[PDB]
Copies of this chain bind each other. A is one copy, B any other.
């Protein structure tokens, strides 16, 4: 099941991302249940917003929010919920929400799957519009959810994203 997918072929540069929410999708937040491996509805979002990229996580990791570290994966067409994509990290949006520190990695499809994102080497290669739209999304999607909130710290580079991947794999390994 999805519970058995590796974190990656060669962390932190070569990772697998389990997708929970497609790009260009309806405003439903899904989460994989750690017990059954099934996709559960987590929230019907109350704002008229949508996840700006495909969204999911790296298996066998843990952020301080108590869930696997989160990943945004840009693709040319939306991915299937519950599918897995091999990717390469290029940057990270550092942020906190009500559940704890809650970084959002950005990882692009690995070169073996497509040449499209090979030119994206680091965070400055991502489009400025996309990065601004992502930060705005996280800043506002919980605006009508009482007791839920976000504080964005800012964008950091690929080396920072890789360090976040390492830290989150260690946290899961260790407790």
A residues lining the B interface (CB < 8 Å): 1-2, 4-5, 18, 24, 26-28, 30, 33, 35-44, 46-52, 75-86, 109, 113-116, 127, 129, 132-134, 136-137, 140, 143-144
Report the Cα distance A5→B109, complex, angstroms. 30
Answer whether A83 and B143 are a contact pair too, CB < 8 Å, given A49-B49, A116-B127, A133-B48: no
Give this chain's copy count.
6
Q: List 6 A-B contacts (CB under 8 A).
A: A1-B1, A1-B38, A26-B76, A39-B82, A82-B82, A116-B129
Given contacts A5-B38, A38-B82, A38-B84, contact A144 B133 (CB under 8 A): yes
CB-CB < 8 A to A51: which residues of B?
48
CB distance from A69 to the nearest CB of B (A): 19
